[PDB]
Every structure is written in C-alpha cells, then in structure tokens.
Design a protein around this ligand. Sequence first.
Ligand SMILES: CCCCCCCCC(=O)OC[C@H](CO)OC(=O)CCC
Ligand SMILES: [Rb+]
Ligand SMILES: [Rb+]
Ligand SMILES: [Rb+]
Ligand SMILES: [Rb+]
Ligand SMILES: [Rb+]
Lengths: 211, 106, 219, 101
Amino acid sequence: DILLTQSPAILSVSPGERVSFSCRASQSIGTDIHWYQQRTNGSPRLLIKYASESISGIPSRFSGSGSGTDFTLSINSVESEDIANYYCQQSNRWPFTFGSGTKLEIKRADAAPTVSIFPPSSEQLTSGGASVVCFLNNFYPKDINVKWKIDGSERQNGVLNSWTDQDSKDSTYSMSSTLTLTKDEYERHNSYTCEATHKTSTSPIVKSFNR
Amino acid sequence: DILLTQSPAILSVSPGERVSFSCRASQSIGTDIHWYQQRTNGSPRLLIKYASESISGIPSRFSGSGSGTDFTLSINSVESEDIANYYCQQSNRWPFTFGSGTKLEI
Amino acid sequence: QVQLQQPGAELVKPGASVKLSCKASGYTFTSDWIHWVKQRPGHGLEWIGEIIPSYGRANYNEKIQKKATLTADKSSSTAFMQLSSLTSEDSAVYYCARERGDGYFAVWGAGTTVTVSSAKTTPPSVYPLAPGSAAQTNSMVTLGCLVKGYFPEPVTVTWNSGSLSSGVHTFPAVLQSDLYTLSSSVTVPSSSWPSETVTCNVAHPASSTKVDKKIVPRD
Amino acid sequence: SALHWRAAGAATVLLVIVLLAGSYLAVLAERGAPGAQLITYPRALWWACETATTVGYXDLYPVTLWGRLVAVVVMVAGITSFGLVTAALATWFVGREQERR
Ligand SMILES: CCCCCCCCC(=O)OC[C@H](CO)OC(=O)CCC
Ligand SMILES: [Rb+]
Ligand SMILES: [Rb+]
Ligand SMILES: [Rb+]
Ligand SMILES: [Rb+]
Ligand SMILES: [Rb+]
C-alpha cells in the first residue's frame, strides 16, 4: 500500500523564517494528500486538505503545494505556537496511510534557566516521605545538568529527572529534578542544594534551603 | 515477464516470534499474488490467495498483505511446523511466474 | 462543541479485553466513517480500521495483527472498538476520528490512553510547592504542585481551572516501582500572590478521582 | 400526459436515484480492497455519471465483485434511460409527422 515518506524527521529554523516540510508518496496520488498538526500531548489537527486547500481557523501563514508524488507543507514566518509534529495522510488509495512525521524545532536566543527550589510539604511528611523539588525553567539550549548536594555533599540516590519538549509558548525548554527520601533520611540533614550547569554561564546557578 | 523477488532468501526467528516474508514485483500486479509453503520433501501448499485471502485448513496464524509491487506474508508466533520454503506466484500477467523462495529457519 | 467524546483511560491486564467508546455529536450523515488510529509514546499515527455506522461495515489495516473489532450504535451515536487479548505491545493512545467520506479526518477525539499492565489502579498524591522562607522573590514567583503515587497514566493538571495557562509547565511523568510521578509549575507576578488564589486541579481518569489543591505560603 | 413522455421522465428520476445509490454502494463495496480508488463519494458520483453515459474515461473504476455488480446496474440504468428518451422522441416525431401529412 502507499508509503508516505517525510524527511527530514526534524527541521530546525530561526523565528520568523520560512519552513517547508516534505512528503513523498511511493506512487502517484494526484492531490489526495492532507496535513495534520499534533502538538505535545494534543490530538491531531487538520491544517490543509487536498494538498493545497485551506481550512477555517488555521492561520493564513500555513500553505500547501504539490501534486503527484511530491508534496510540501509550508509555513511563512514560523512562530512558537508552530512547534509540533506534522503528518501527511493520503486518501487516494485504500487503505488510507500516514507519513512517519516531521518535528518542527525553533532556534531562539540563549536563555539562562530560572531555578526554584521547593522543600517538601507538610502533607507529605505526614505520610512519611520528603520530596525536594527543583525546577530549571525556560532555558535554551536544551542541554543542561543539575547537581544535588546535601550538607555540602553531592547526592545521587533517589534523584529522578524529567525534561519537557520545546515549549510552544516561547521555544524554551524546562526540566524538573526530584530528590526523594524517607521522612527519617530527610531529618538527619539540614542543607539541601540544587545546582544548574548551563551554556549561558561559566558559573553554576544554585538554590538551597535548610529545614 | 514479471520478476518476483523474494529477499532475504533465509529468515531466522525465535520460537513464537512474528515473521514477515517479502515479495517484490518488477511492475504493478494489483493483488494478484498467491503464497505457497513447501516443506522438505513435500509438494507446494497454497497458504494465501490474492495477497490477503485465507484458505480453508490453513492456521489462522498465517496472513498476507500488500498491493501493487510490494507484498508480505506474515506468521504470527512462528512454530516448528512452519519450517519450510515459501514462494509467491503472480497471476496478473501471462505467463504466471514464481518468486525464488524464502527459507524459514528457527 | 466537542464532536467526538472518548474516555481518558483504560487499564487492562495481559490477556484481558477492553472496549473503547467514541460518542459523536454535531452533524451526522449517512456518508460518515469513524476511524480508529493508534499512537504509541513518542511514535507516529498508525491507522487501525474504519466503520460506516449507517450501514455497519468495517474494514481493517491488513499489515498488522487484528486486535480490533468495530461496531456502531445508531440510536446512541456511538462507535465502539473492542480490543482483545492485549499485551504491552497494545498500550498506546487510541483516537477515533471522523471522516465525511471525502478522505480527510476533519475531527479527532481526545484519545483514550490504554495501559496493559498486571499492576493496579492508584490515585495520585497532590502536594503543594511554595517557596521556602529564605527564597528571595523577583518580579515573578513560581509555585507548583507534586503529583505522585499514581497508576496508570495519565493525569491532567490545570491551574485555576484553565484560567491560568501561560506560565504553566507540567513535566512528563517518570515511572518508578509501578507508580508514576510528575510536577507542574506555574509562574505568576510576585505581587499578585497570595492575594489572588492559585490552585492546581489534578484529574486522574483511570480512577475517576479529580482533586484541587490550593497553594499558600509556608507559615 | 403521453405514456412515452412519462416513462422518460420516470427513467430520468430513477437514473438520478441510481447515480446516488450507486455512488454510495461503490464506496461501500470498494473500501477494504487494497489498491482500490473508488473510495470517496464526490469522485464516486462522478464515476457513476461517466459509467451511466457509458463514457468510462477509466480514471476510476471498481476492482471488487460488488463494486462491479453495482457498475453493471449503473450502466444498464443509464443505457436504458437514454434509450427510453430516444424512443419517446421517435414516438413524438412519428405522431407530429403523420399530422404534417
Ligand atoms: C453483471 C455482471 C457482473 C460481473 C461481476 C464480475 C466480478 C468478478 C469478481 O471480482 O469476482 C471475484 C470473485 C473472487 O473474489 O470471483 C468469484 O468467484 C465470483 C464469481 C463471479
Ligand atoms: Rb460508449
Ligand atoms: Rb466508452
Ligand atoms: Rb473508454
Ligand atoms: Rb482508459
Ligand atoms: Rb447508443
């Protein structure tokens, strides 16, 4: 059945620039190609139908073109809300099929991360556990390391990290690091430190708190 | 005339796993492809006709798919009795022709 | 208004079977087809099958093993997909979409996250995250809420019932010992809190347990 | 009025009905067959028109048993309809002519 190839799988552009996603069909399908946008955690959204026809509610910035085997979805002056995955789908022949997807990535100005440290809550301690959450927010590039020091000593056990995908609001990335330890373990210590190493600074940005 | 290419010629899988044999036609033949199984010393046995249609007496584990030039014969959870050679054959254009064969090894 | 309504989640044990639903509203025609699409974490969209309610016929993706059986209900405008004898390979978000018979999916459901595990449902623990007494505040302040001990995915976290969207970041869940944990963060102008309430609403579909959590300063 | 003109009109209305049910049933017949192209309704209705007028460019055609059976019905309904009109035009011409004499 019809194979739809979307390449490259990841496209990086500068804010405001012109971007073009490509979809190539394994055989000729006239103009029976449709484009969808699916943002992080969202459901797909129809952008263009029959290769070049606009849809209501979709910014005029979006356009499509092509016929036969080669198709392009274009974005005039890309912006942050356009950060998503983009899929093509053909309805020329049974069964309908989808292309594998192209991710849009935006290259913005370097941003230092905003660090926030949070002591465990009272409701947690009551249950018998303590989680010290640290947020590294709105940084760019996405590359970043975070170190945990308890009473001046680097800690590594019980530290779970999580990163977000590029943000559709400002094109930045964020990350959350959480150090979990029993109510006890949390008792016999006073200083809890979160350190962030990022390209924007030779010196790490740190945040601490003493219970 | 229509060349049917079966590659790889030998496929090795682990018991119970999913296997997929491929048959590629030199030109478009709709769904006019049929699959046969020939065990050691046996005569060929029809498994699937017209690319995806089941045959009576053949385990449900066997399935086929594809249209145009690319075809697949699939086996869901392969077992020992499936050890054999597998051939595709096209009836879209005269004369009928056979692919060169894929051996299943476990 | 929402055109296709689907449950947020379903937990299924290996070998068991589940039946997903998709309630449709808005204009309905004799030429509508309801499609089912499967998406696994990180990966793309995979077409599963379709059904035409007005006649009851369904077709299926032949390149994949048949785990689905589709049916529709004309009276209740609902299409159903019976997935049976599942394994971890079947865990994914399953969307229904509607096609007016002209080939493109004009509208999609929100999707039903299906989890195939021998584990057990478990509501999350929602704890507040307010700055510590020593935290120097800038022109803005960041608060958040910790959601842990839940299963299976997902949970939907909003701030002040969606009323506060910008400044929000809910991090992806991490799995440790058959339980998920995540945190959401919100940033509001420092001067506006706590004079103006900031609450985090956490919904966990798999156990029908939605809970609020007001964020106030530490003593 | 005259029987021939009624049969004509009737055949035309019926043809419009066969074209619409024909489009519906063709898509229903063809979805599910790998490679089939007679699978969305707007182009199927166009396919129905070009089959009934027997023009058959194709640009689209059925590949399943039921789509083909549906095709034969559309053909026959159109050939019969257009034939009924010719026949009515002959009846009308034969009458006015016997008068002109
Ligand atoms: C009014 C004349 C209509 C003729 C329609 C022919 C359809 C041929 C076909 O696809 O038939 C497909 C099937 C196999 O799938 O062949 C059979 O065993 C059916 C016997 C005709
Ligand atoms: Rb003709
Ligand atoms: Rb003709
Ligand atoms: Rb012709
Ligand atoms: Rb032709
Ligand atoms: Rb004629």
